[PDB]
Design a binder for these strands. Structure first.
Lengths: 132, 132
DNA sequence: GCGTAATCTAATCAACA
DNA sequence: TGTTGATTAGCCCATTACGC
DNA sequence: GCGTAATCTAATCAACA
DNA sequence: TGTTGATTAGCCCATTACGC
């Protein structure tokens, strides 16, 4: 069971497109600034940019048009989430049970740990990658 | 269980390519003439030409080069196989049991009917298409 | 069924102990 | 420096499944 | 796993009753 | 003319699965 996909409003989609033309590699500050402007969580904005770039990369390559890329200084990343030893212990127990937690499983770990669900999702991605 | 694919010899592949450059839409006479020259049944030759054309069509389209097509008068088709009423009755019974007979099932129908297995395969193709 | 948000892997950047 | 959280790309014309 | 023979559908040509 | 045997093409850049 994956996350119930969300439906952008017309005005939300315009703000995403506009900010994407301004800079298609926004930092955490930009994303949070946009997230708060349009009323959806920053993790959703991050995903949209990742998908939009992938959509644009696929298109520029079909048009045989070169892809501009990272224009301007790279914006600041997210702060490296600090995860305590106990928080880790819960993820390890959740991981041996199910490597692929759904949105239901992830959202409960975010209660049992206090970690943002978005970060828990990334933790499992990295874990699955580094522990076959 | 599908037919055990066959492996062309180098000299067989050259004769196929050569005849394909001569005419990529050979009639039954040409195919049988080539089949007997290289030592594999005409149904195999027919399949090869059908696949080779499909391979060539996919390539010319990637190269943006136009596909020549049927050059010269169209060569004669195969004689419309005559199928008796009893032969049909066996195919209908085999069809209600299994719409997708394998090579094992088809090769036995060719004994129980006297029809070429290649024609039995075509019969099922047409039947499945016209009787959902 | 289409559009695409959600998801995934493999690699690489990069903070922190 | 190792570990691990963070970010990014993802590359083309029926489909299926065997022999090599 | 790659190359591709084997297979498939949907449509269309075409013989025969 | 209907039925059915015969022949041909097959159309593009991570994958999955939901909301519309």
């Amino acid at each position: 069971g994956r996350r119930r996909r969300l439906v952008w409003t017309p005005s939300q989609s315009e703000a995403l497109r506009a900010c994407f033309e301004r800079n298609p590699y926004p930092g955490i500050a930009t994303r949070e600034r946009l997230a708060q402007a349009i009323g959806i969580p920053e993790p959703r904005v991050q995903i949209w940019f990742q998908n939009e770039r992938s959509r644009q990369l696929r298109q520029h390559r079909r048009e045989s048009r070169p892809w501009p890329g990272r224009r301007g200084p790279p914006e600041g990343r997210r702060k490296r989430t600090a995860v305590t030893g106990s928080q880790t212990a819960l993820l390890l127990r959740a991981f041996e049970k199910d490597r692929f937690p759904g949105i239901a499983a992830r959202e409960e770990l975010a209660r049992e740990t206090g970690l943002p669900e978005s970060r828990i999702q990334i933790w499992f991605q990295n874990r699955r990658a580094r522990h076959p």
